[PDB]
């Protein structure tokens, strides 16, 4: 009542694209526990790793990071399927309690933060003070990562689609297709947000027999 | 549907 | 220089799930213009509804509602294949100018809201003095959204795997796997995130042969 | 990657 223990700054994990995903926010009171389903990003991911990081920005190398731990054994599956359940659990103690569990196979991998760790007092208010004054440089790096995450999702989609559609594909459809899938793939390797999307409005411009028959 | 990598 | 044409409340609209997704945000300074990526929830949809939303609520019936209107003539395609650009574009009289465009076909529809319209000076108060009281009731709406939309992508994607699996599916898996499959599409239809997350557990403990198969 | 409803 007269005091509150609280995170000052949010908790939370990288995920595809370089990005902090958070799990606890900035400001929470403790003890608290938090729970998110991730997936893997690629086919056949057989591992994912869990990097803990604690801060205020966008960007996952831009915060401070708590550390990080494997989890294995992940079946076969195709991208995005496997459910590996992420949870932040902070106790009364202010120990926080980092685990992933594969739903699939029951197995569970943790890490245990001490309380002491992470940011002292001035670097929290060096933190948010950086979060404030990069707040568009942040928004431009996330709608970045949405981008490219959008752009890849159609790349593995779109080859998915085409291997499944084999001879009713025509010709001169696959062969735009792929021509287009090459430049995407190709664009997806950098920066540049418009050069992505160019890419991904010509795949979308010549895809339509494709996206007729894959439906 | 957040996806995480393999490092 | 001694004042700023702001943004009061956060713009956006209404995504799956039925919660409001932000295009603009709130104190944000004018003229801006704003752009991000959508597709369709359904197989073969032929054309999305584009509901703008003012306010700092997750569910988008909180929120003011600034109008709507159709985007049609979207060709046949899978699910999340379509790419609709929605572009929020304030100008310096303050009027915001809302367009969707169909990326395949170059089609789009737009829709103006005068710079008066929204919610009034008190109004804003009130939804700013709202927001901050119902902060985690919105959060356990925002993280049932997500469950139920994971649930819906798992259901969705284990139905054309299945498919696409045919013969190659043992039959002790398949009747394992619909029996799941059928539990999780009820669950989905429901607001018990446990039990939407219990059955894709389930689904996820059954379907090991099938994402063998699909991977 | 967000969907749109059509109503």
Do not use: W, Y
């Given at each position: ?16 694209g ?17 729970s998110?389903?991730?997936?893997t990003?690629e086919?056949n ?18 915060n ?46 943790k ?15 060096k ?17 970045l ?23 009713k594909?025509?010709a ?6 792929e ?5 995407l793939?190709?664009?997806?390797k ?6 992505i ?10 895809s ?8 | 549907?957040r ?5």
């Amino acid at each position: 009542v007269l005091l509150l223990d609280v995170t000052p700054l949010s908790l939370g994990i990288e995920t595809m694209g370089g990005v902090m995903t958070t799990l606890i926010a900035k400001n929470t009171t403790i003890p608290t526990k938090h729970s998110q389903v991730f997936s893997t990003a690629e086919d056949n991911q057989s591992a994912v790793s869990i990097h803990v990081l604690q801060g205020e920005r966008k960007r996952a190398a831009d915060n401070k990071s708590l550390g990080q731990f494997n989890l294995d054994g992940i079946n076969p599956a195709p991208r995005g399927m496997p459910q590996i359940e992420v949870t932040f659990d902070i106790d009364a103690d202010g120990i926080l309690h980092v685990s992933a569990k594969d739903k699939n196979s029951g197995k569970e991998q943790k890490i245990t933060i001490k309380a002491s760790s992470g940011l002292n007092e001035d670097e929290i208010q060096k933190m948010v003070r950086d979060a404030e004054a990069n707040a568009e440089a942040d928004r431009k790096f996330e709608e970045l990562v949405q981008t490219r995450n959008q752009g890849d999702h159609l790349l593995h989609s779109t080859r998915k689609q085409v291997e499944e559609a084999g001879d009713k594909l025509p010709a001169d459809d696959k062969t735009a297709i792929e021509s287009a899938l090459t430049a995407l793939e190709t664009a997806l390797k950098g920066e540049d947000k418009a050069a992505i999307e160019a890419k991904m409005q010509e795949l979308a411009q010549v895809s339509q027999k494709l996206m007729e028959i894959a439906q | 549907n957040r996806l995480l990598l393999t490092g």
